[PDB]
Automatic annotation (TrEMBL), chain A:
Keyword list, A-Z: Antiviral defense
Protein name: Type III-B CRISPR module RAMP protein Cmr4
GO BP field: defense response to virus
UniProt xrefs under Pfam families: RAMPs
Location of the CRISPR type III-associated protein domain: 8-271
TrEMBL record, chain B:
Name used for this protein in its record: RAMP superfamily protein
Residues annotated as domain CRISPR type III-associated protein: 77-312
InterPro entries per UniProt: CRISPR-assoc_prot_TM1791, RAMP_III_fam
Pfam name, any one: RAMPs
Gene symbol of the encoding locus: cmr6
Gene Ontology terms: biological process: defense response to virus
Coiled coil segments of this chain: none
Native source organism of the sequence: Bacteroides fragilis
UniProt keyword list: Antiviral defense
Automatic annotation (TrEMBL), chains C, D:
Main subcellular location: cytoplasm
Coiled-coil region(s): none
Protein name, entry field: CRISPR type III-B/RAMP module-associated protein Cmr5
GO biological process: defense response to virus
SUPFAM superfamilies: AF1862-like
InterPro entries: AF1862-like_dom_sf, CRISPR-assoc_prot_Cmr5
Location in or out of the cell: Cytoplasm
A Pfam family hit: Cas_Cmr5
Species this protein is from: Bacteroides fragilis
Gene Ontology CC terms: cytoplasm
Keywords, in A-Z order: Antiviral defense, Cytoplasm
Family: Belongs to the CRISPR system Cmr5 family.
Length: 279, 314, 136, 136
RNA sequence: CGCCACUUCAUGGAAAUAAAUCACUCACGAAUGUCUU
């Protein structure tokens, strides 16, 4: 009841700038986790974007998010927003346009987070994800692996000639886990996923500034690829029930699209937020 | 596999063009000078280019359908033949024979050719008077730039909407509201969530009967006509290909040459001294028509001066 | 990625040793674009295509582009000279032969992340080192 | 920390001496952003890359960005002038030569913990002293 | 009318630029001002 896990499905190339200076090729990098070095959204940015979406409902924002800055009455927000961590990232291939890529360490982190935070429907997900991770570890036996669960994706090149996909027939993929993580799922080793998600491999978009049709500036912007999945934790801090119901209804409505990150005017950070479906 | 891109049987076009293009194969050499000019290297690159230029796109594509669901009703325009080029400045070159020398703009996830929303926004803004920044270098051409573009914007607005007369300050306010979402200055207008202009990515929608990517040549002849030319091979979007432009546009309210919010304009209307002569309104449909006219006028992409990237109504 | 001061020192000596920096602490203005374009090519097309393009000696370019690949090789050699014993067990500490083609060295050693990371760090170091001197 | 009045005085004198503030107590607007961004660049990147970026002349910028590096060098020189010369002290009091770029000095004068501390303090003093003046 | 091919396969420019650099609130509140031998 208190804690729910929400999945973020991005519909365009999303950029949450870290704001730091990079003197290499990429001038603008994206936010990364302080521990795992994976792309993420700061909880402040998530809360700001969601508050911007709900700004019209003044009572709901005041009860859930808190008081507006520099208001005379500073009242704390009741709902607690946790940072969104990368769940699945699309990887380019030769057999299919893109595949859903997740590492064993990402799965273990998700299992640990569900154990610690005690999500609403966490028990079945933890059980099945632990079973899947144990099967993957048994099959790998300490080596690098790229495991697909579709027999047609055998021998697929996951963005790099070194990484080739093998299909272990013994390991089953439950349909709810497929829905959570994504179709055409590949389980990568930590080394492979770190290589595929580092600064030399993440997609970059080139932009230039034109003055009377002549280029004045030029820079590269790192982006999180479209259709990437991130999970964040929402804690119900004794907030009012009806406002909470309205919040979850609007948030999980299929017609709802939320903008998170930078470059809103050029259609960058548009996402769909989904709740953890019961298993 | 070879045609009809889809999501189940395809190779990521950006992947093929950038990462898999220069894969190291047995008996294929392009490190040495002899290898780069050899016929084996030319055959290798010819096969790679043929793989690139064999994919079609159906109108009922689940990718394009998902794009339509996410970003709304598209603006469908059709490519004419010089071709269409996007991302020409992306580095893709080694010095070999039969390879694509210029870059191409591919979506990372889907792999489809696309035009980033930044490109569309900049192209549309370039035909507005206040696109050029007031700077020391630009101050020589600054007056003529705005003078020429303001007339064009005026006729286009009078064409697309019912407004009989528009002022220079009104045009400035409209431009800064559409592109900057602010006032001409640095002031912010209290806008609602829906009162924002968003320029999504233009995607290739449907190649009716044929592939969507073709190969083209630009062959510069140097300043010496007695020297040999220089064949440059690049990848272009084929003519007769449907491009889907996605926008999120709102209604702009102008009262006394200033941009007003929707609730602001409601309050202004409710007042006693409401002059209907000073009230102007451009709707989202009229904004779309304005953008369509701009696109049909100048086009989008690279080498637009020499014809590339011109569009016709579907 | 943080560029160390020793990497910038290596870049300075490599740019002097090949002949990017003249005796009066000046360099031709086109090498700036050369190094920036090499970084962009590495990030976009890949390590091997960029190395092959900028390694070519039969160019129509204004200046000697292959000298930037030479500077790359010298910087990588200097970096590998200071690899620790425990680093040599994980990382390849062998010196790249002077006359060896860099592209074929990378190909024969694979496409390992070590070489790509070293190339990117050395390219950033070269850019920073050129930023310290005057463009003719 | 707390604001050091002597460092603020040094910053005032260096800003006047490096032709940042005109005869009227006024400065070009972009220098505020320059001073503010210098500290963030120093923290996020290395000290050497930040000093290279800001000391770089012939750049494409709205004003003379290397003037802030000149101001920093003048402030560091004043601090080293005021340093107490006693045994069992850590700070080295030798001044930075006027013919020396700051990048070169930091390059060949490593173990730069003292230099890092001085540069951060001088940046803070510059930021706080620039507020006495008006931006055009 | 017959017979017959060679040549050329990227250079130059832009490689980040400005705005915001913490803001508001709380800055001590209550008890004890002598007590027991």
């Amino acid at each position: 009841m208190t804690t729910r896990m929400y999945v973020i499905n991005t519909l365009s190339n999303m950029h949450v700038g870290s704001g730091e200076v990079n003197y290499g090729v990429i001038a603008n990098l994206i936010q990364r986790d302080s521990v795992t070095n994976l792309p993420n959204i700061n909880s402040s940015g998530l809360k700001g974007a969601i508050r911007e979406y709900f700004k019209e409902n003044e009572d709901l924002v005041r009860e859930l998010f808190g008081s507006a800055p520099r208001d005379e009455k500073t009242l704390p927000g009741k709902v607690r927003f946790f940072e969104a961590n990368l769940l699945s990232m699309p990887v380019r291939s030769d057999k299919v346009p893109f595949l859903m890529a997740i590492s064993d360490e990402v799965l273990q982190e998700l299992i640990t987070k569900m154990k610690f935070f005690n999500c609403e429907e966490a028990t079945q997900y933890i059980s099945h994800l632990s079973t899947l991770l144990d099967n993957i570890k048994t099959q790998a036996q300490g080596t690098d692996f790229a495991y697909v669960f579709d027999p047609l994706l055998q021998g697929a090149i996951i963005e790099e000639v070194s990484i080739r996909a093998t299909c272990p027939s013994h390991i089953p993929l439950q349909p709810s886990l497929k829905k959570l993580l994504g179709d055409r799922l590949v389980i990568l080793s930590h080394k492979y996923f770190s290589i595929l998600s580092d600064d030399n491999h993440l997609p970059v978009l080139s932009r230039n500034n034109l003055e009377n049709g002549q280029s004045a500036n030029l820079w590269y912007e790192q982006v999180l690829p479209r259709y990437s999945r991130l999970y964040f934790m929402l804690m119900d801090g004794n907030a009012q029930s009806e406002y909470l119901k309205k919040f979850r209804d609007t948030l999980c409505t299929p017609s709802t699209i939320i903008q998170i990150g930078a470059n809103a005017s050029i259609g960058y950070g548009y996402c769909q937020i989904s709740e953890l479906s019961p298993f | 596999m070879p045609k009809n891109y889809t999501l189940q049987n395809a190779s990521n076009l950006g992947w093929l063009f950038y990462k898999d293009y220069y894969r190291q194969e047995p008996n294929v050499d392009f490190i040495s000078t002899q290898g780069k000019e050899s016929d084996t290297t030319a055959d290798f690159f010819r096969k790679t280019n043929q793989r690139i230029t064999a994919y079609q796109l159906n109108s009922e594509s689940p990718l394009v359908a998902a794009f339509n669901n996410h970003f709304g009703t598209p603006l469908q325009l059709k490519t004419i033949y010089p071709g269409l080029i996007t991302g020409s400045g992306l580095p893709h070159q080694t010095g070999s024979k039969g390879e694509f020398k210029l870059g191409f703009q591919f979506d990372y996830t889907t792999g489809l050719p696309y035009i980033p929303g930044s490109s569309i926004k900049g192209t549309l803004r370039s035909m507005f008077p206040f696109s050029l920044k007031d700077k020391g270098s630009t101050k020589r051409i600054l007056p003529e730039y705005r003078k020429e573009r303001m007339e064009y914007i005026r006729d286009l607005i009078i064409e697309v909407t019912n407004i009989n007369e528009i002022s220079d300050t009104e045009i400035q306010a409209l431009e800064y509201a559409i592109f900057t979402n602010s006032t001409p200055s640095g002031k912010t207008i209290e806008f609602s969530l829906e009162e924002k202009d968003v320029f999504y990515d233009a995607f290739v929608a449907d190649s009716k009967d044929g592939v969507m990517l073709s190969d083209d040549y630009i062959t510069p002849h140097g300043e010496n006509p007695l020297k040999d030319p220089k064949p440059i091979l690049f990848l272009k979007i084929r003519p007769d290909v449907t491009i889907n432009f996605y926008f999120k546009l709102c209604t702009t309210h102008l009262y006394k040459e200033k941009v007003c919010s929707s609730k602001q304009i409601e309050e202004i209307k409710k007042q006693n001294d409401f002059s209907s002569s000073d009230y102007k309104m451009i709707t989202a449909h009229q904004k779309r028509n304005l953008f369509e006219k701009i696109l049909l006028c100048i086009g989008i992409g690279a080498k637009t001066n020499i014809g590339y990237g011109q569009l016709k109504k579907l | 990625m943080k560029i160390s001061k020793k990497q910038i020192e290596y870049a300075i000596e490599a740019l002097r040793a090949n002949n990017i920096i003249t005796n009066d602490n000046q360099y031709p203005k086109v090498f700036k674009g050369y190094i920036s374009s090499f970084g962009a090519a590495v990030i976009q097309s890949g390590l091997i295509p960029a190395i092959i393009f900028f390694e070519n000696e039969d160019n129509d370019a204004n200046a000697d582009r292959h000298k930037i690949i030479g500077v790359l090789k010298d910087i990588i050699n200097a970096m590998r000279q200071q690899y620790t014993v425990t680093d040599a067990t994980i990382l390849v500490s062998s010196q790249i032969p002077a006359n060896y083609s860099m592209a074929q060295y990378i190909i024969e050693h694979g496409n390992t992340d070590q070489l790509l990371k070293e190339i990117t760090e050395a390219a950033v170091a070269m850019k920073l080192a050129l930023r310290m001197y005057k463009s003719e």
